[PDB]
């Protein structure tokens, strides 16, 4: 289909994830630090984001936010083993305390400069506070 029928907001953060995974696959399988270590450090994070549970689908904007957190590099410091707990806790907090932000993305259909400004502060503050 060529992504002819897809929301504008999702394209911005998925077109860039395609390249990350395509470049991760071609190198990171061998049965330096400038390029290679960073590449698989990002790829191992990106793989863990795609796992999901059972009998629990998600709305579009929450997926947009959770992918937006990963793609920009806000999670390149945490150990990969603890990513799922961060996903769950951050989703619950965002759903509860920021119900007005999601409606903006749903109604507009695309991101904006003000929305992009808000999300960085929210992500950095919650990352700082969430260390348990």
């Amino acid at each position: 289909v060529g992504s002819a029928a897809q929301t504008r907001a999702m394209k911005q953060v998925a077109g860039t994830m395609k390249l990350e995974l395509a470049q991760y696959r071609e190198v990171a399988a061998f049965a330096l630090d400038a390029a290679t270590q960073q590449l698989l450090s990002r790829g191992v994070r990106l793989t863990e984001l795609l796992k999901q549970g059972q009998y629990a689908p998600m709305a579009i904007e929450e997926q947009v936010a959770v992918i937006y957190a990963g793609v920009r590099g806000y999670l390149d410091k945490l150990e990969p083993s603890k990513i799922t707990k961060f996903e769950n806790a951050f989703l619950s907090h965002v759903i509860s305390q920021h119900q007005a932000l999601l409606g903006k993305i749903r109604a507009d259909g695309k991101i904006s400069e003000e929305t992009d400004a808000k999300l960085k502060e929210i992500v950095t503050n919650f990352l700082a506070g969430f260390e348990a």
Binding site: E26, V27, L32, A34, A35, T36
Partner: peptide, 23 residues
């Protein structure tokens, strides 16, 4: 092969920039 030829492009680009800046 992917790693070995990913390594050389940085040197080639750096030398291109230095050459073009010099002249």
């Amino acid at each position: 092969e992917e790693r070995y030829f990913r390594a050389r492009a940085r040197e080639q680009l750096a030398a291109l920039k230095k050459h073009h800046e010099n002249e």
